[PDB]
């Protein structure tokens with residue numbers, strides 16, 4: 383059944399709750415972003431109102447074939463009324479189209495639902511600065527102090543410098559980047575930019591990217607693999623067997639592959655820095671795991687919550703085990719006692 387952490391009290395609303403059939407008492411289904419664990423269940427047969435960003439609406443229409451009459455896109459940073467309730471959509475700094483949602487309940491309670499987010503100090507100057515938030519529905523993916531990772535900028539600088547060096551030493555090296563969803567487009571676009579190439583990909587992935595309102599996108603991507611020296615493949619193909627196989631397909635145009643797997647966290651983060659990362663190598667193939675995160679580190683999450691000072695926190699991630707729930711509750715109490723709210 384629909385879990386309580388997916389329901390907004392005092393409303394008929396639900397958030398990211400499309401796999402339970404008809405939720406009794408739901409008048410509007412919000413969708414924070416186009417990731418499959420969140421949209422699971424949507425299709426062309428859905429006949430209730432879906433509220434979301436413009437970009438998420440583009441993907442629902444073109445990729446899932448949801449009918450236009452049920453898609454309700456909202457602009458960001460704008461007070462909107464939905465079924466008699468004031469709401470605002472904020473940029474979540476996750477993947478393209480991803481939002482946080484502010485609900486203003488008729489009784490005066492203000493609720494923030496973060497969706498999936500990477501907390502940033504820039505959020506402290508959004509419309510969130512303007513009133514008190516009583517209840518926070520929080521993306522707790524990395525809520526434990528072992529989870530450190532570098533800035534996105536630092537990671538992109540490493541990837542750009544590595545690729546440019548490799549290809550300038552060997553003009554017959556191919557760069558391959560893995561993907562299994564939207565997000566992390568900066569990794570492959572930044573590398574293609576330094577190399578003066580477009581990125582080449584399947585027809586399905588090109589279609590997905592043409593939904594994202596990325597400026598000058600026609601200048602940066604292509605379905606013609608032969609003309610491109612940055613290829614995107616399914617994350618599943620980023621291993622030595624999959625990459626050897628891919629290299630056969632290019633007809634002796636290339637004699638070396640340098641591949642990037644943008645992971646979330648990996649336990650080499652507790653010891654090693656970004657400057658010190660090394661690849662796994664077999665023969666003429668090298669694979670780099672780079673810690674490019676679209677979720678809060680522990681310290682980013684803690685700073686956001688200690689700034690916001692909510693009265694009650696409702697985790698939305700890692701809620702399935704008692705040991706996870708208890709650990710998270712301990713951190714929330716620590717944060718509250720340190721900051722004095």
Ligand code: NI
Nearest residue numbers: 415417476498
């Ligand atoms: Ni997500």
